Design a protein around this ligand. Sequence first.
Ligand code: V9Y
Ligand code: V9Y
Ligand code: NA
Ligand code: NA
Ligand code: NI
Ligand code: NI
Ligand code: NI
Ligand code: NI
Ligand code: NI
Ligand code: NI
Ligand code: NI
Ligand code: NI
Ligand code: NI
Lengths: 174, 174, 174, 174, 174, 174
Amino acid sequence: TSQVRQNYHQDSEAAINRQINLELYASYVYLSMSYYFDRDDVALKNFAKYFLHQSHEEREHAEKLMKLQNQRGGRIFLQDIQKPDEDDWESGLNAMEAALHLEKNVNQSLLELHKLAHDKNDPHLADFIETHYLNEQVKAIKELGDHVTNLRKMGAPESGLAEYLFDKHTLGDS
Amino acid sequence: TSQVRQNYHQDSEAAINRQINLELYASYVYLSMSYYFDRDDVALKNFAKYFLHQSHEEREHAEKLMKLQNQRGGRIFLQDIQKPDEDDWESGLNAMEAALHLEKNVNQSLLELHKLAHDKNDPHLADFIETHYLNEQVKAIKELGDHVTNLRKMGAPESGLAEYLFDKHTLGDS
Amino acid sequence: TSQVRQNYHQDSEAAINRQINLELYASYVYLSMSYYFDRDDVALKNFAKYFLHQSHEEREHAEKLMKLQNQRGGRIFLQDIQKPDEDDWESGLNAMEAALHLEKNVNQSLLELHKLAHDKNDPHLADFIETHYLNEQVKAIKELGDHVTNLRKMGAPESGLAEYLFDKHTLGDS
Amino acid sequence: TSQVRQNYHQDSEAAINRQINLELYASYVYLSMSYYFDRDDVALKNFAKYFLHQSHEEREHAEKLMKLQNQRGGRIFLQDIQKPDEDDWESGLNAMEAALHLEKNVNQSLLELHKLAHDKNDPHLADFIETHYLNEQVKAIKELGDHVTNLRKMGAPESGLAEYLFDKHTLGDS
Amino acid sequence: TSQVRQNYHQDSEAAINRQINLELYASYVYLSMSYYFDRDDVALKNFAKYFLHQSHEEREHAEKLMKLQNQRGGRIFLQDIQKPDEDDWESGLNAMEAALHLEKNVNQSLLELHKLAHDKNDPHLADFIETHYLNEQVKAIKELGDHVTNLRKMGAPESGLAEYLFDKHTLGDS
Amino acid sequence: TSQVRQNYHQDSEAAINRQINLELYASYVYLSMSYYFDRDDVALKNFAKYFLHQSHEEREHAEKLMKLQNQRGGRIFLQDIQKPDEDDWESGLNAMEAALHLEKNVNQSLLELHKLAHDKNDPHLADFIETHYLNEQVKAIKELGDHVTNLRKMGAPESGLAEYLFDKHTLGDS
Ligand SMILES: O=C(NO)c1ccc(C(=O)NO)o1
Ligand SMILES: O=C(NO)c1ccc(C(=O)NO)o1
Ligand code: NA
Ligand code: NA
Ligand code: NI
Ligand code: NI
Ligand code: NI
Ligand code: NI
Ligand code: NI
Ligand code: NI
Ligand code: NI
Ligand code: NI
Ligand code: NI
């Protein structure tokens, strides 16, 4: 057992390892989406750029969790990163909706990790979760919901004009 | 009675107190609208930004009136700020039309305050009204009417595409 | 029901709406006080400046809560902003004491909102409260208590010299 | 009883006073170690510099707690600062191990102070602990464990060459 | 079938998809290694930094292949990223040797992809491989072999002093 | 016995160890006072700032003595730092008078340490005392006496106005 461990339950250690796999999964989903919008029969550069940013952000999420595992004295165990459910993401609107489902899934996973940390009276772990994950999740969810709302009111996905313009006017400056 | 008072009728003092309450009311209306466009099921950032600016401007209007009350020797009496008529503002076009009605209401209130000041032969009060309120009202009214006209010719509120584009191209730079 | 809502109790939603009304109320109290010190028969510019700053800060508090309501998926409902208990604030010392009572009231309201969020196992809401409200309350309370102590040891409110000097030497640079 | 106190248990007040004494104790331990490495028969400048930094950091920890006591309305009571267990710290490796034991002790003390604050439903106190102490403890513990590991793999304390080189290559730039 | 495809065999398309999975695998291996050196019982920051750089470089390799797939008209199909063979990488020397085996594996895969492209008379694909992969592989292999040689001549992995010094003097500036 | 020792009596070594404990004691006294003026029922920021500066200066005094002990070949032995006589310092005037008593005590201790060094014909030790302690003591004593005189002529401690103004006009710029 390691010299820095203190107040660190094994249930928490397992949970962090599960969360690492989840954040890498999300990274892979977003990479898949990004390059779907790179296809010559979709060709929406700013959708592609948007989801590529999200994919690198989730990779950083995963790395912060791994640093945390080592900080608290736990051992990293890595597992396979399952492939996204889809290879074809249909449309900008549909990709954004899958991103909404994804982030809500990841959010309930964090909220249970927080439940877990408060119940094993691990306040350091709890505040780590609050400070570095919980509000980033709320922000990501509000943002993807704003986008789904605008794509819908424009006429997406029935109107290809709507997705083109959304790509130029909303994902062209941030 | 106060040492600086001169040529300041009590009807005018009451009127300024009424006008303070009105300008705070307008501030509250615009705050309500601003955050309606912040909702994830409306998501029009630049509408929200537009009405938030107007709300801070009306708060400054109110403060200038309070400074004026104290300048002329009158006493400030504050009252409740009634809630906006609506919690849901339907659409960008409808919000803009409510803003037009609002500013015309506030304008007739100022025009009667000016009537009042000219009839109690208070030229300082009269020129205060002309210089700091009357033309700001005419400008605000022309501006909101321009906007209602453009939203209508675009197809608002039936076309969600129209409101999206108006938010990007007219309220995105000023 | 809205697409971004997750782990957000309706008791919490109601509570945020109550807290918004409270922070706007505080804003109105401080505006009232500010312009009482602007009167020609009180004439304490730096008291006025002090309470005007506090009033704009409480308006920002309210806006942050409204942004939060929309972020978590809740609906904003606004209510009347009741008028301050007083129109005449007697003196700098008395105004400062009313400000102390006010901030303690607002603080117990936040502490119950936090109780509520921890009991509905809403850690995002809980950390929002800790990070953006709780310590600002402790700071505001210590500050107003320091001031009440100094005004008292100087001879306020019996000595008008004391309030004059406090206005020049303590509220003249910060 | 003081005018700023709210939601501040007397058990918490006592606890902060205990924690102040503990953080000053740690400061004294590190000062002792620092100047042990200053001895002409040890002469490891960067060990000395390392532990002197830690000693000033613990003094700042103590001061932040005292500011907090006064902020929440409590009264500071100071006690004797007991002398370090040792006057002779044997070696760089041994000093680092005593520093590891020390910080773990201080950490369990903070974790109980947090337990205490959550149980007396003092969220301001709880978030203070999370934000300003808990993660600084985890960082300090990981750091001292990294160092103990490297000194051991080098051949410390049997090899005086190992400690010399560690002092030059690990504690010579940070 | 897609409008940009020309001279692009389906065997090549499959091969690029296999190579994408391989470059992501390598990325995962290096991430695993990086954070093994982050452990408090290994604590070799510059090994960790070294393998983390390699892991981000392999992620860029994968992305360049995906861009290429879309450029030539092929369709991206993603698969699971299998976990590294080990969770514990034993030592700096052993990690470096696994990195050598890895890059040679990836290199023979590229050399067969090139064989394939020259035999389906796809010169664009062939020169892509030469310009963006083949020489990066030769460089990576020479580099890891240099390192394995130096760690061995120093006394690794039997001497923990050797790995410490290698981490400071060879992976501390590049 | 140590290789650098020359002309260094054991009575002197003991004396330096006593003086180290004394300078740390003074540091603790001043910290106690500083945070007494931080209390919300005293609230004299510049008194607090004044005594906090003095407390860090005495900590530096102690460290210079410890460096000197090691320089001359002596061994540092640390002891408990006794708590200040008081937890409540009554008033600015009273705190300043306790500071005067304190510095005179420390001064006679240095003057005996100098007596001791001249009698064991240790001129290096003697000039160290003259150059780094004796005149700093005379300066500190004149300064605290100036302050006690001004607080008294103002009406302290009977007049809380006097202490307020002294805090603003004498301890507000130096
Ligand atoms: O503008 C006027 N005063 O400034 C004014 C209004 C009505 C009359 C009047 O009585 N005309 O016969 O004058
Ligand atoms: O009594 C309880 N469960 O039945 C309980 C113990 C600790 C807590 C808690 O975490 N309060 O914030 O609740
Ligand atoms: Na927290
Ligand atoms: Na070529
Ligand atoms: Ni994430
Ligand atoms: Ni709890
Ligand atoms: Ni107006
Ligand atoms: Ni006329
Ligand atoms: Ni507030
Ligand atoms: Ni500490
Ligand atoms: Ni070297
Ligand atoms: Ni590669
Ligand atoms: Ni001294």
